[PDB]
């Protein structure tokens, strides 16, 4: 089903893209996984640590 939904949009079925480098602009070989992950922010904030 995840392949099916990645195919609904025109994304690549294998879940991996080819990113290009932002500093040299040359494509990273070996295509990378890029997706949308849900990042929390645990409140071990540094400025109560330092």
């Amino acid at each position: 089903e995840i392949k099916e939904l990645l195919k609904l949009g025109d994304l690549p079925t294998s879940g991996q893209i080819r990113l290009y480098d932002g500093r040299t602009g040359e494509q990273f070989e070996r295509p990378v996984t890029v997706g949308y992950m849900y990042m929390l922010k645990l409140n071990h904030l540094v400025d109560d640590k330092m």
Partner: protein, 197 residues
């Protein structure tokens, strides 16, 4: 113990392995008497009270005087479970405009550190005998061998062994195969150019 702080270590791969990042806030606070003496030695502040006022206002010359003080004064870094004698090392502080003690990557093997929240504690050595102990007996460039056995404790861990591995390998038919090169400089001149895998 006084002249001491703790905070969260981060990676900072840009470093050498004899320095450690150190936030301007931490640095300016652990090193107060040093800055006070230096501001009243350079004449940037009349008294010591004037120097305290200047620092607590954090003027543009306070930072430069800080970076003058910091220069060769190595600070000790220590972690919580000091399992062995490499749990305490000493680095030279590279002032870091931030709030996390950027600790060089290769040293996490020794410290048993990792960057998911492990706090490290920085100590300042005051006297001159202390700075010479730290720079001569405890510097992070002086203990590259595990004291358990002469094998080094500086072995690259995970991003770097995988990068090095991916580099020194070989496909069976890649770009630019077979050609012969005048040396390693020509190797990089091809690779960065884009003519050889």
């Amino acid at each position: 113990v006084d002249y001491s702080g703790r905070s969260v270590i981060t990676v900072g791969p840009y470093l050498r392995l004899h320095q450690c990042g150190l936030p301007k806030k931490m640095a300016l606070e652990l090193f107060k008497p040093f800055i006070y003496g230096k501001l009243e030695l350079r004449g940037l502040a009349t008294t010591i009270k004037a120097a305290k006022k200047m620092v607590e206002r954090e003027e543009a010359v306070v930072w430069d005087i800080l970076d003058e003080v910091i220069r060769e004064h190595p600070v000790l870094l220590n972690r919580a479970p000091t399992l062995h004698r490499l749990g305490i090392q000493a680095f030279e502080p590279v002032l870091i405009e931030g709030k996390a003690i950027q600790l060089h990557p290769l040293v996490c093997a020794a410290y048993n550190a990792d960057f998911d929240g492990d706090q490290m504690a920085v100590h300042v050595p005051l006297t001159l005998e202390a700075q010479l102990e730290a720079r001569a007996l405890m510097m992070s460039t002086n203990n590259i061998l595990s004291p358990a056995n002469g094998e080094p404790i500086i072995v690259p861990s995970q991003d770097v062994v995988l990068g090095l591995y991916y580099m020194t390998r070989d496909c069976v038919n890649a770009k630019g195969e077979g050609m012969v090169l005048t040396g390693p400089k020509e190797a990089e001149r091809l690779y960065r150019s884009g003519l050889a895998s």
